[PDB]
Design an enzyme around this catalytic site. Structure first.
Site, mmCIF file in Angstrom:
data_model
loop_
_atom_site.group_PDB
_atom_site.id
_atom_site.type_symbol
_atom_site.label_atom_id
_atom_site.label_comp_id
_atom_site.label_asym_id
_atom_site.label_seq_id
_atom_site.Cartn_x
_atom_site.Cartn_y
_atom_site.Cartn_z
ATOM 1 C CE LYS A 53 3.629 25.621 -12.218
ATOM 2 N NZ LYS A 53 4.395 24.641 -13.033
ATOM 3 C CD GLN A 97 0.842 27.485 -14.855
ATOM 4 O OE1 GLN A 97 0.451 26.563 -15.564
ATOM 5 N NE2 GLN A 97 1.610 27.293 -13.789
ATOM 6 C CG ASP A 120 8.414 24.368 -17.206
ATOM 7 O OD1 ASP A 120 8.055 24.463 -16.013
ATOM 8 O OD2 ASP A 120 7.811 23.658 -18.027
#
Lengths: 287, 287
Positions: A53, A97, A120
């Site tokens: 990412k 995460q 997200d």
């Protein structure tokens, strides 16, 4: 003779587009989008994720604000960091995460992120908005799949779609996303009786169970569009999807390969949402 | 020979239960739940709605904080009232009756209500929570229908359910609510091709199109459970549902009458959610 849905290439195109738009911004005296990735602990899988990412991110020109914290950090510390991240005008996106240390309230932490920074698409606010036909920042995976269908000029309206999964991260938002596209959605899970029946009529299939070869290519409706979200790394080193590619490829009209299908779209979409949060919510250039 | 799902009686039972729990509270020195109904303008339909809600409310023992405002009130005034209503510890629920004056940002106003006070279940936060299998205050109509199935001892797990509708107020939350109950959900709308097909296999039907006799009793699968949410008042004075009762009653195993089926459950549920917001979120009696 199925047509291949090159998710690898499409994702490359999407990454390219976000690049240009960032160059344009800087060239006009405007700041670049800033993403903040928060990795707590040392899970080897998480490391490869957060790194992939952070790479795409620096590749498109965003400002990286990485935070690699210890597995010991308290919940009050993790929340304190988020409050501070929400109040920073340089940061447009916040990606915490998962998995996170057991003992830390997972929801209390994730929901602490302001929805406009929730790149997200996890926050129940952006989820509700997606359900109410008024989308803000949308869940990465489902949105990535919609982009795939778009880039290949696929008419989604009137299509009979089945989503084998029903999860919070894929299945459920996948259905909401498909209705917004005009598909008659059907969502299956474990209690589903006669799964073969539902799959038999589906014009658009979307598998997300996490079990190799779970859906035999035998079941696929001739002409259907297969979207395999599963990525199962067998003990013999091979990587396969939830569908039997060989057989399914013969029946289908379009199909996503594994890997190089949906996977590369999840990261492309995150990048895309980060741009969107900057351009529209945090520092928009109004008329 | 379908069995009748007496929504009128069930709703009476639900109202009775909330009554007892309010008596218990007062008898122990605790305040009663307080609902605030905000009616702006003078739409005759809205008047009958707001009155029916205010009646059930006083019938169960809640504190009524009614606000009948002019159709002229500004958006800044309507928001100002809500901020004030959110900060009042006596008020557990806030119900802003719709339609609202055109010119007033409908979403800006409704979303201004704190989710813990959103007894109607409109806020995208409570909607997202419902989608993510972690429900807070749930949408009244869909929740009312689930209660109906419960009170009649209906096993929802493994059932193949079809929701003809896909609206923000019924269809969409109806699907999320049915998945949480273990049903293989299918949501249809206007782009749906061959609607007769989907209805043909459904074990549980849920119609919400708003068109009299739209679904012929011919289509219903023998043994199915019909839930008619539609209430169409014909010009001849008669009130009928979206389904042809006569025919459908013969095929079905269980069916909701119109009126006296789903309608009385929507108001019962609002009452129920008001209690829930008090007992759990605003003034809970912890261990």
């Amino acid at each position: 003779a199925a047509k291949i849905i090159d998710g690898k290439t499409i994702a490359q195109q999407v990454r390219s587009e976000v690049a240009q738009k960032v160059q344009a911004r800087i060239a006009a005296g405007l700041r670049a989008p800033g993403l903040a990735v928060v990795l707590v602990g040392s899970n080897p899988a998480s490391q490869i994720y957060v790194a992939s990412k952070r790479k795409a991110c620096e590749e498109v020109g965003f400002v990286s604000r990485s935070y690699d914290l210890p597995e010991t950090t308290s919940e009050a510390e993790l929340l304190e960091l988020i409050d501070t991240l929400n109040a920073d005008n340089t940061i447009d996106g916040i990606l915490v995460q998962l998995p996170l240390p057991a003992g830390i309230d997972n929801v209390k932490v994730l929901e602490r992120i302001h929805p406009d920074k929730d790149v997200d698409g996890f926050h129940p606010y952006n989820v509700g908005r997606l359900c109410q036909r008024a989308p803000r920042l949308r869940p990465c995976t489902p949105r990535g799949i919609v982009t795939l269908l778009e880039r290949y000029n696929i008419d989604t309206f009137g299509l009979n779609a089945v989503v084998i999964g029903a999860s919070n991260i894929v299945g459920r938002p996948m259905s909401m996303e498909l209705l917004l596209a005009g598909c008659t959605t059907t969502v299956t899970h474990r209690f589903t009786k006669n799964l073969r029946h539902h799959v038999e009529n589906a014009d658009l299939l979307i598998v997300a169970v996490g079990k190799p070869g779970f859906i035999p290519g035998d079941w696929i409706k001739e002409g259907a569009i297969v979207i395999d979200v599963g990525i199962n790394r067998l003990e013999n080193g091979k990587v396969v999807g939830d569908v039997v590619f060989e057989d399914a490829a013969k029946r289908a009209s379009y199909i996503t390969p594994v890997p190089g299908g949906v996977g590369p779209m999840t990261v492309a979409t995150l990048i895309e949402n980060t741009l969107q949060a900057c351009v529209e919510y945090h520092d928009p250039q109004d008329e």
